């Protein structure tokens, strides 16, 4: 049946949301120069 398909889809969606949260944190952790390039060297 498609129950396993739905379970795998839900697991993949949860992993995608987790990866998206990690990427969101990485955005702020990765700009890191835009705020302070005005006096960077």
């Amino acid at each position: 049946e498609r129950r396993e398909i739905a379970e795998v889809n839900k697991k993949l969606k949860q992993k995608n949301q987790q990866l998206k949260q990690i990427m969101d944190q990485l955005r702020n952790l990765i700009w890191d120069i835009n705020a302070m390039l005005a006096m960077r060297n």
Binding site: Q18, L19, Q21, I22, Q25, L26, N28, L29, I30, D32, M36, M39
Partner: protein, 105 residues
């Protein structure tokens, strides 16, 4: 380090043997060993110390009115510490990203 070495040498030579040379003439208590101490350390050491002191006295005398010998007084040494702070913030952000990645396992 020139002036520092000169001051160190003057300090090391401040306690000369001239103050201890007051027991050199009494060395002739065996006939009418270390009799040489009554020649080199009697007055020549004191003369050399006085000459060195006089030389050190007659310096350029730079300080006249205000505050010379400055040299920090100013800019981005502060911003150097600020860049160290940016490095620390980047460290904190990298640690947060690593914690997020670990949670992603």
């Amino acid at each position: 380090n020139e002036r520092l070495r000169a001051l160190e040498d003057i300090e090391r030579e401040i306690g000369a043997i001239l103050q201890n040379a007051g027991t050199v003439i009494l060395e002739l208590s065996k006939e009418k060993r270390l009799l040489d101490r009554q020649a080199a350390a009697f007055t020549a050491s004191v003369q050399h110390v006085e000459a060195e002191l006089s030389a050190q006295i007659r310096y350029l005398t730079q300080v006249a009115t205000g505050q010379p010998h400055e040299g920090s007084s100013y800019s981005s040494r502060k911003d150097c510490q600020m860049a160290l702070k940016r490095v620390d913030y980047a460290r904190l952000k990298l640690s947060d990203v690593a914690r997020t990645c670990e949670q992603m396992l």
